[PDB]
Write an enzyme that holds these catalytic residues in place. Sequence first.
Site, PDB file in Angstrom:
ATOM      1  N   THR A 158       0.778  -1.252   0.000  1.00  8.64           N
ATOM      2  CA  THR A 158       0.000   0.000   0.000  1.00  8.64           C
ATOM      3  C   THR A 158       0.811   1.305   0.000  1.00  8.64           C
ATOM      4  O   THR A 158       0.669   2.098  -0.929  1.00  8.64           O
ATOM      5  CB  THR A 158      -0.958  -0.036   1.200  1.00  8.64           C
ATOM      6  OG1 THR A 158      -1.788  -1.179   1.051  1.00  8.64           O
ATOM      7  CG2 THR A 158      -1.804   1.240   1.347  1.00  8.64           C
ATOM      8  N   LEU A 669      22.060   3.852 -12.267  1.00  8.40           N
ATOM      9  CA  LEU A 669      22.615   4.854 -13.184  1.00  8.40           C
ATOM     10  C   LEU A 669      24.029   4.514 -13.603  1.00  8.40           C
ATOM     11  O   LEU A 669      24.778   3.896 -12.848  1.00  8.40           O
ATOM     12  CB  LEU A 669      22.573   6.263 -12.562  1.00  8.40           C
ATOM     13  CG  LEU A 669      21.216   6.742 -12.095  1.00  8.40           C
ATOM     14  CD1 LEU A 669      21.336   7.906 -11.129  1.00  8.40           C
ATOM     15  CD2 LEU A 669      20.302   7.021 -13.271  1.00  8.40           C
TER      16      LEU A 669
HETATM   17  C1  LIG Z   1      14.246   8.409 -10.394  1.00  7.65           C
HETATM   18  O1  LIG Z   1      14.082   9.818 -10.449  1.00  7.65           O
HETATM   19  C2  LIG Z   1      14.779  10.484  -9.392  1.00  7.65           C
HETATM   20  C3  LIG Z   1      14.402  11.946  -9.488  1.00  7.65           C
HETATM   21  O2  LIG Z   1      14.912  12.553 -10.667  1.00  7.65           O
HETATM   22  C4  LIG Z   1      16.279  10.220  -9.512  1.00  7.65           C
HETATM   23  O3  LIG Z   1      16.854  10.595  -8.265  1.00  7.65           O
HETATM   24  C5  LIG Z   1      17.679  11.726  -8.243  1.00  7.65           C
HETATM   25  O4  LIG Z   1      19.015  11.335  -8.513  1.00  7.65           O
HETATM   26  C6  LIG Z   1      19.954  12.416  -8.592  1.00  7.65           C
HETATM   27  C7  LIG Z   1      21.296  11.773  -8.858  1.00  7.65           C
HETATM   28  O5  LIG Z   1      21.526  10.670  -7.989  1.00  7.65           O
HETATM   29  C8  LIG Z   1      19.929  13.241  -7.305  1.00  7.65           C
HETATM   30  O6  LIG Z   1      20.629  14.455  -7.559  1.00  7.65           O
HETATM   31  C9  LIG Z   1      21.529  14.922  -6.573  1.00  7.65           C
HETATM   32  O7  LIG Z   1      20.870  15.814  -5.659  1.00  7.65           O
HETATM   33  C10 LIG Z   1      21.694  16.175  -4.543  1.00  7.65           C
HETATM   34  C11 LIG Z   1      20.828  16.954  -3.557  1.00  7.65           C
HETATM   35  O8  LIG Z   1      19.793  16.054  -3.128  1.00  7.65           O
HETATM   36  C12 LIG Z   1      18.810  16.600  -2.284  1.00  7.65           C
HETATM   37  O9  LIG Z   1      17.888  17.464  -2.976  1.00  7.65           O
HETATM   38  C13 LIG Z   1      17.022  16.823  -3.930  1.00  7.65           C
HETATM   39  C14 LIG Z   1      16.209  17.916  -4.589  1.00  7.65           C
HETATM   40  O10 LIG Z   1      15.353  18.562  -3.656  1.00  7.65           O
HETATM   41  C15 LIG Z   1      14.362  19.357  -4.234  1.00  7.65           C
HETATM   42  O11 LIG Z   1      13.133  18.657  -4.487  1.00  7.65           O
HETATM   43  C16 LIG Z   1      12.417  18.186  -3.327  1.00  7.65           C
HETATM   44  C17 LIG Z   1      11.180  17.488  -3.838  1.00  7.65           C
HETATM   45  O12 LIG Z   1      11.502  16.405  -4.702  1.00  7.65           O
HETATM   46  C18 LIG Z   1      12.105  19.350  -2.387  1.00  7.65           C
HETATM   47  O13 LIG Z   1      11.424  18.898  -1.219  1.00  7.65           O
HETATM   48  C19 LIG Z   1      13.396  20.087  -2.038  1.00  7.65           C
HETATM   49  O14 LIG Z   1      13.144  21.187  -1.167  1.00  7.65           O
HETATM   50  C20 LIG Z   1      14.103  20.556  -3.308  1.00  7.65           C
HETATM   51  O15 LIG Z   1      13.292  21.536  -3.956  1.00  7.65           O
HETATM   52  C21 LIG Z   1      13.796  22.127  -5.156  1.00  7.65           C
HETATM   53  O16 LIG Z   1      13.376  21.387  -6.312  1.00  7.65           O
HETATM   54  C22 LIG Z   1      11.949  21.211  -6.422  1.00  7.65           C
HETATM   55  C23 LIG Z   1      11.701  20.306  -7.611  1.00  7.65           C
HETATM   56  O17 LIG Z   1      12.229  19.000  -7.396  1.00  7.65           O
HETATM   57  C24 LIG Z   1      11.248  22.570  -6.501  1.00  7.65           C
HETATM   58  O18 LIG Z   1       9.838  22.380  -6.415  1.00  7.65           O
HETATM   59  C25 LIG Z   1      11.702  23.482  -5.359  1.00  7.65           C
HETATM   60  O19 LIG Z   1      11.148  24.785  -5.506  1.00  7.65           O
HETATM   61  C26 LIG Z   1      13.226  23.539  -5.236  1.00  7.65           C
HETATM   62  O20 LIG Z   1      13.809  24.198  -6.353  1.00  7.65           O
HETATM   63  C27 LIG Z   1      16.179  15.758  -3.228  1.00  7.65           C
HETATM   64  O21 LIG Z   1      15.307  15.118  -4.153  1.00  7.65           O
HETATM   65  C28 LIG Z   1      17.082  14.741  -2.531  1.00  7.65           C
HETATM   66  O22 LIG Z   1      16.285  13.781  -1.839  1.00  7.65           O
HETATM   67  C29 LIG Z   1      16.870  12.538  -1.426  1.00  7.65           C
HETATM   68  O23 LIG Z   1      17.360  12.602  -0.085  1.00  7.65           O
HETATM   69  C30 LIG Z   1      16.372  12.818   0.939  1.00  7.65           C
HETATM   70  C31 LIG Z   1      17.131  12.820   2.249  1.00  7.65           C
HETATM   71  O24 LIG Z   1      18.007  11.696   2.393  1.00  7.65           O
HETATM   72  C32 LIG Z   1      15.272  11.753   0.878  1.00  7.65           C
HETATM   73  O25 LIG Z   1      14.200  12.105   1.752  1.00  7.65           O
HETATM   74  C33 LIG Z   1      14.727  11.565  -0.537  1.00  7.65           C
HETATM   75  O26 LIG Z   1      13.871  10.427  -0.551  1.00  7.65           O
HETATM   76  C34 LIG Z   1      15.852  11.383  -1.555  1.00  7.65           C
HETATM   77  O27 LIG Z   1      16.498  10.120  -1.340  1.00  7.65           O
HETATM   78  C35 LIG Z   1      16.887   9.365  -2.502  1.00  7.65           C
HETATM   79  O28 LIG Z   1      17.981   9.967  -3.221  1.00  7.65           O
HETATM   80  C36 LIG Z   1      19.242   9.985  -2.530  1.00  7.65           C
HETATM   81  C37 LIG Z   1      20.209  10.756  -3.398  1.00  7.65           C
HETATM   82  O29 LIG Z   1      19.787  12.106  -3.564  1.00  7.65           O
HETATM   83  C38 LIG Z   1      19.678   8.556  -2.208  1.00  7.65           C
HETATM   84  O30 LIG Z   1      20.912   8.549  -1.498  1.00  7.65           O
HETATM   85  C39 LIG Z   1      18.596   7.870  -1.380  1.00  7.65           C
HETATM   86  O31 LIG Z   1      18.964   6.528  -1.079  1.00  7.65           O
HETATM   87  C40 LIG Z   1      17.242   7.924  -2.085  1.00  7.65           C
HETATM   88  O32 LIG Z   1      17.263   7.090  -3.239  1.00  7.65           O
HETATM   89  C41 LIG Z   1      18.066  15.441  -1.588  1.00  7.65           C
HETATM   90  O33 LIG Z   1      17.404  15.905  -0.418  1.00  7.65           O
HETATM   91  C42 LIG Z   1      23.011  16.846  -4.992  1.00  7.65           C
HETATM   92  O34 LIG Z   1      23.924  16.872  -3.891  1.00  7.65           O
HETATM   93  C43 LIG Z   1      23.685  16.027  -6.114  1.00  7.65           C
HETATM   94  O35 LIG Z   1      24.882  16.639  -6.611  1.00  7.65           O
HETATM   95  C44 LIG Z   1      25.831  15.818  -7.312  1.00  7.65           C
HETATM   96  O36 LIG Z   1      25.972  16.229  -8.676  1.00  7.65           O
HETATM   97  C45 LIG Z   1      26.439  17.583  -8.809  1.00  7.65           C
HETATM   98  C46 LIG Z   1      26.312  17.959 -10.267  1.00  7.65           C
HETATM   99  O37 LIG Z   1      25.002  18.438 -10.561  1.00  7.65           O
HETATM  100  C47 LIG Z   1      27.855  17.696  -8.248  1.00  7.65           C
HETATM  101  O38 LIG Z   1      28.266  19.060  -8.308  1.00  7.65           O
HETATM  102  C48 LIG Z   1      27.898  17.210  -6.797  1.00  7.65           C
HETATM  103  O39 LIG Z   1      29.250  17.116  -6.357  1.00  7.65           O
HETATM  104  C49 LIG Z   1      27.194  15.863  -6.608  1.00  7.65           C
HETATM  105  O40 LIG Z   1      28.007  14.800  -7.095  1.00  7.65           O
HETATM  106  C50 LIG Z   1      22.702  15.639  -7.244  1.00  7.65           C
HETATM  107  O41 LIG Z   1      22.206  16.752  -7.995  1.00  7.65           O
HETATM  108  C51 LIG Z   1      18.502  13.576  -6.870  1.00  7.65           C
HETATM  109  O42 LIG Z   1      18.528  14.127  -5.560  1.00  7.65           O
HETATM  110  C52 LIG Z   1      17.630  12.322  -6.840  1.00  7.65           C
HETATM  111  N1  LIG Z   1      16.264  12.656  -6.473  1.00  7.65           N
HETATM  112  C53 LIG Z   1      15.497  11.867  -5.707  1.00  7.65           C
HETATM  113  C54 LIG Z   1      14.107  12.361  -5.436  1.00  7.65           C
HETATM  114  O43 LIG Z   1      15.902  10.792  -5.269  1.00  7.65           O
HETATM  115  C55 LIG Z   1      16.599   8.741  -9.755  1.00  7.65           C
HETATM  116  O44 LIG Z   1      17.963   8.603 -10.147  1.00  7.65           O
HETATM  117  C56 LIG Z   1      15.686   8.110 -10.812  1.00  7.65           C
HETATM  118  N2  LIG Z   1      15.933   6.676 -10.890  1.00  7.65           N
HETATM  119  C57 LIG Z   1      16.474   6.056 -11.962  1.00  7.65           C
HETATM  120  C58 LIG Z   1      16.831   4.610 -11.776  1.00  7.65           C
HETATM  121  O45 LIG Z   1      16.664   6.636 -13.026  1.00  7.65           O
HETATM  122 ZN   LIG Z   2      -3.015  -2.056  -0.050  1.00 12.21          ZN
HETATM  123 ZN   LIG Z   3      25.801   3.947 -10.651  1.00 12.50          ZN
HETATM  124 ZN   LIG Z   4      -3.365  -5.085   2.328  1.00 12.59          ZN
END
Ligand SMILES: *[C@@H]1O[C@H](CO)[C@@H](O[C@@H]2O[C@H](CO)[C@@H](O[C@@H]3O[C@H](CO[C@H]4O[C@H](CO[C@H]5O[C@H](CO)[C@@H](O)[C@H](O)[C@@H]5O[C@H]5O[C@H](CO)[C@@H](O)[C@H](O)[C@@H]5O)[C@@H](O)[C@H](O[C@H]5O[C@H](CO)[C@@H](O)[C@H](O)[C@@H]5O[C@H]5O[C@H](CO)[C@@H](O)[C@H](O)[C@@H]5O)[C@@H]4O)[C@@H](O)[C@H](O[C@H]4O[C@H](CO)[C@@H](O)[C@H](O)[C@@H]4O)[C@@H]3O)[C@H](O)[C@H]2NC(C)=O)[C@H](O)[C@H]1NC(C)=O
Ligand SMILES: [Zn+2]
Ligand SMILES: [Zn+2]
Ligand SMILES: [Zn+2]
Length: 783
Positions: A158, A669
């Site tokens: 769910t 990835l």
């Molecule tokens: C499925 O699709 C997914 C989404 O596209 C793909 O996942 C993405 O993968 C990339 C690469 O791995 C990753 O990018 C990195 O981000 C790092 C920062 O991460 C944090 O921030 C993002 C973004 O936050 C924004 O969005 C949320 C809402 O989604 C919002 O609440 C925030 O406030 C913020 O808002 C801003 O954007 C929104 C629009 O999105 C606007 O509305 C708003 O106004 C703002 O502008 C978060 O998504 C991240 O969240 C992860 O971590 C938290 C805390 O742990 C978890 O709660 C959450 O579930 C999520 O966890 C998952 O991802 C992490 C990795 O991020 C895993 O470890 C974990 O196990 C989970 O799987 C973060 O809070 C940034 O540091 C990083 O930088 C690197 O690259 C740059 C170059 O650009 C270099 O300079 C650096 O040195 C670094 O090497 C990079 O950009 C995305 O964060 C990630 N997104 C998600 C949602 O997971 C996925 O790959 C794809 N699957 C497949 C198989 O294709």
């Molecule tokens: Zn159910």
């Molecule tokens: Zn990889």
């Molecule tokens: Zn059930």
Amino acid sequence: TNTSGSCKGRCFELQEVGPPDCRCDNLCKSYSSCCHDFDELCLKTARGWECTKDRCGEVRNEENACHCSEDCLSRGDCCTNYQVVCKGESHWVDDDCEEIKVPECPAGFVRPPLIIFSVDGFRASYMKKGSKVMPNIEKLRSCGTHAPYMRPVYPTKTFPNLYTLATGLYPESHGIVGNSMYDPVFDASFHLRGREKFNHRWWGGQPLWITATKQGVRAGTFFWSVSIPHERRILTILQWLSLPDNERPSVYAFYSEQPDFSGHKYGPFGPEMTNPLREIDKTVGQLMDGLKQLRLHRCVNVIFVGDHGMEDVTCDRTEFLSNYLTNVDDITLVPGTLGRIRAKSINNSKYDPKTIIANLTCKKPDQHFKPYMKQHLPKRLHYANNRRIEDIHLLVDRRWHVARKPLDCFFQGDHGFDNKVNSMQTVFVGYGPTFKYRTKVPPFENIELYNVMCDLLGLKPAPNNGTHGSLNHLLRTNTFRPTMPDEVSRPNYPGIMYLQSEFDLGCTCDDKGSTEERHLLYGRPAVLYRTSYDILYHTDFESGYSEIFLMPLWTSYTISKQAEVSSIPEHLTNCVRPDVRVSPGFSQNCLAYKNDKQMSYGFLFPPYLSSSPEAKYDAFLVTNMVPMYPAFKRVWAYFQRVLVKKYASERNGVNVISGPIFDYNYDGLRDTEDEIKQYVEGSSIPVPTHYYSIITSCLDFTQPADKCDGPLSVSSFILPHRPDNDESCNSSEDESKWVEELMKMHTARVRDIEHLTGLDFYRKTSRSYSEILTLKTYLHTYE
Ligand SMILES: *[C@@H]1O[C@H](CO)[C@@H](O[C@@H]2O[C@H](CO)[C@@H](O[C@@H]3O[C@H](CO[C@H]4O[C@H](CO[C@H]5O[C@H](CO)[C@@H](O)[C@H](O)[C@@H]5O[C@H]5O[C@H](CO)[C@@H](O)[C@H](O)[C@@H]5O)[C@@H](O)[C@H](O[C@H]5O[C@H](CO)[C@@H](O)[C@H](O)[C@@H]5O[C@H]5O[C@H](CO)[C@@H](O)[C@H](O)[C@@H]5O)[C@@H]4O)[C@@H](O)[C@H](O[C@H]4O[C@H](CO)[C@@H](O)[C@H](O)[C@@H]4O)[C@@H]3O)[C@H](O)[C@H]2NC(C)=O)[C@H](O)[C@H]1NC(C)=O
Ligand SMILES: [Zn+2]
Ligand SMILES: [Zn+2]
Ligand SMILES: [Zn+2]
Ligand SMILES: O=C(CCN1CCc2nc(NC3Cc4ccccc4C3)ncc2C1)c1ccc2[nH]c(=O)oc2c1
Ligand SMILES: *[C@@H]1O[C@H](CO)[C@@H](O)[C@H](O)[C@H]1NC(C)=O
Ligand SMILES: [Cl-]
């Protein structure tokens, strides 16, 4: 938390109020923050939910649940059958289907509203099996747009599925990896029952209601308190739809705990299941009659969707770890339809994950589960890249449960199994002005719905796991125009530039124009990252050779229905030839494989399928060579020698695109060169974690693959590159008894291969890009 405030003129208000002020919204009960008079004012039940002849034209009474008075329509609080009982109208279900060519919205409405009607545990087969007891659902299905089934995400539970629906993300990405969870960083546990689930630290990504609000679109409530009856939820939606233009939300969601709750107790097809289905249908009817009397039945877009299915699971069909393990009391197990193993925390230094895996690996002839380290799970599951996912995983067989001991009947049904299992499939119905009329669409994954929901509301979707444009064929209008991604790296086209004498690769061989048209049928794959690579042409194949990885990124070849399969001649067994187009410095060497006592090599283009003995020498080029463990060579050689020809003969030729994958961090990835954690002994040659193949042919099998007009047909796999075949319990036997089964388990979407390689396929076709996007999201299930 001042409860002394009142709910007078605030029942189910949409503006959320923070402390000290008490809440009058639906979630106030779940957070224990309602005003003292919430239940009395907001949750009336007197005289039921239906109008009767005697109540028609009554004087308004505050005590009633809903009203049958003449002012009720303007007040938006009539009982849903008011106009039927009082004004002689017909029920929506009794009307014939009329196409909604344009939205017929009352003046003031900016856009047609979206109503997401979600049903728990509603299995795909209920649509056909329960049709006779579900006439309202049958009308929505038949006159709107429907899929035969919708694929849920793994685990087929769910919370991971409803949250995937809201965000468009895989559970490993949004964080809700299960119904029960343990975060080691928080040192806390998430459960179906408890106050920890209410913490926002667990919920990742951006759900639809946040996407809407951030873009100035008013969002109603998605999560409902269990104590609010379904009739009140429906009336609350109708009342919110009656609000003035400036207050009225555009997106709404209804949720039903049924048929799931009854399914667990009575099984998916228990005779007791007819009543819950009749009830869900009655609720649909109420919403539809309610919209008709508000003149919204030809203006609102309705989505009838499920989160997962339900399987026949009894406690007699339980497998116990106490029959395999000695330390079962020294482990924590997330049991049931899946298994996640963790050690018990205090004074358990003797805990060994390797011993647990070995003792769970092929021990009973009829074993009903398989252990895996999460990074060895089929890539299509997307169930590894999250700390809340335990390293030891148990994939349990359908109809089976896993438990620790006989200590730990009541249930007849359950869900949570692999998302490719038939019984786990759920429903999708789209009805309204933006959906097509009387249209059936192919099955799709629920990760795709978030983009469609944004499109229906004119929103810009947050980054998600859906492929935007893949579901355009569901819509009449409001379609997103997709564009192909731009190629980052252009290829080099090398000629003969090196002499055979320049190559000291420790390699030996007894070896003393129309290619692109035949072997590359849909254009060359686009490289979407920065790199150096060469396009190499040969009689039987074409490849894109990586200078950095010292191997092809891709190899493309067509095998006709009539192709002849030959063997590798005895004198060519260990033959490896240098390629005079690629530098010795950008080439692999035989000495590294001689010095690696665990690593052998294989070829991407199969020597077995060469067109002539002369052409066969190209298959032994150093540039067609890839590192392969001896155990994996058993799998790869069988695929190459037997299965490729089998598919060509069955599908009227096939086009094959094969290559390596590197995913050391198991994030799904493409790895950067710095992420590669294994090389051939004392070399720069990286070891792939997986090997892929994309097998394409004509949908119309009367047409050969190399002369296809119309839609394409595809199947793909992502094979794990393992040093042993412990995954396959019959691997001691001949490859014809186990290799194909392994491959079916590791089936993949082209889109999954694209993420892992940074390549873009099908760039040069006669098909529309939306159609190509649908093809890339296709998963061949063998189910
Ligand atoms: C499925 O699709 C997914 C989404 O596209 C793909 O996942 C993405 O993968 C990339 C690469 O791995 C990753 O990018 C990195 O981000 C790092 C920062 O991460 C944090 O921030 C993002 C973004 O936050 C924004 O969005 C949320 C809402 O989604 C919002 O609440 C925030 O406030 C913020 O808002 C801003 O954007 C929104 C629009 O999105 C606007 O509305 C708003 O106004 C703002 O502008 C978060 O998504 C991240 O969240 C992860 O971590 C938290 C805390 O742990 C978890 O709660 C959450 O579930 C999520 O966890 C998952 O991802 C992490 C990795 O991020 C895993 O470890 C974990 O196990 C989970 O799987 C973060 O809070 C940034 O540091 C990083 O930088 C690197 O690259 C740059 C170059 O650009 C270099 O300079 C650096 O040195 C670094 O090497 C990079 O950009 C995305 O964060 C990630 N997104 C998600 C949602 O997971 C996925 O790959 C794809 N699957 C497949 C198989 O294709
Ligand atoms: Zn159910
Ligand atoms: Zn990889
Ligand atoms: Zn059930
Ligand atoms: O915990 C429970 C029952 C409690 N539910 C959980 C989900 C829920 N969702 C909503 N709104 C939806 C509408 C909607 C629409 C789109 C996107 C998100 C959403 C969210 N409203 C209330 C509740 C209350 C449970 C149920 C079944 C189980 N089967 C099993 O095995 O364990 C089980 C436990
Ligand atoms: C594994 O099996 C062996 C042999 O049955 C037994 O001696 C050992 O204790 C078992 N280990 C665990 C952790 O179950
Ligand atoms: Cl769980």
